[PDB]
Design brief:
The structure is cut from a larger assembly and holds chains A (52 residues) and B (52 residues).
Chain A: H1 2-33, H2 38-49
Chain B: H1 4-10, H2 13-51
Classes of the chains: A mainly alpha (52), B mainly alpha (52).
């Protein structure tokens, strides 16, 4: 019984991690949407072409 | 009277041998009841713990 309880607790913790990750990346998407810069985009392009 | 020695032995030996069997059977029933009741109490403890 005690092992079953501990296992359910671990499963709940992993569940919470799964919950947070999806909405976190979905919010990061909007952070990109509302913080992007054309100078930052050009910096990304020039950075990757400098190491291709 | 000498020929009754076997008769007098069969008046005791086989009857005791048979009685040993029911003596064992009653202990077998007691064992079975004890183990069944132990399982039935353990399950009700486990359910209580997990429900908590």
């Amino acid at each position: 019984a005690q092992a079953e309880i501990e296992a359910e607790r671990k499963r709940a913790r992993e569940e919470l991690r799964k919950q947070v990750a999806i909405l976190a990346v979905a919010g990061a998407e909007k952070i990109i949407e509302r913080s992007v810069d054309e100078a930052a985009n050009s910096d990304i392009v020039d950075k990757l072409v400098a190491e291709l | 009277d000498l020929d009754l020695a076997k008769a007098s032995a069969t008046d005791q030996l086989k009857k005791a041998k048979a009685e040993a069997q029911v003596i064992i059977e009653q202990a077998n029933a007691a064992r079975s009841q004890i183990l069944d009741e132990a399982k039935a109490e353990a399950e009700q403890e486990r359910t209580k713990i997990v429900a908590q």
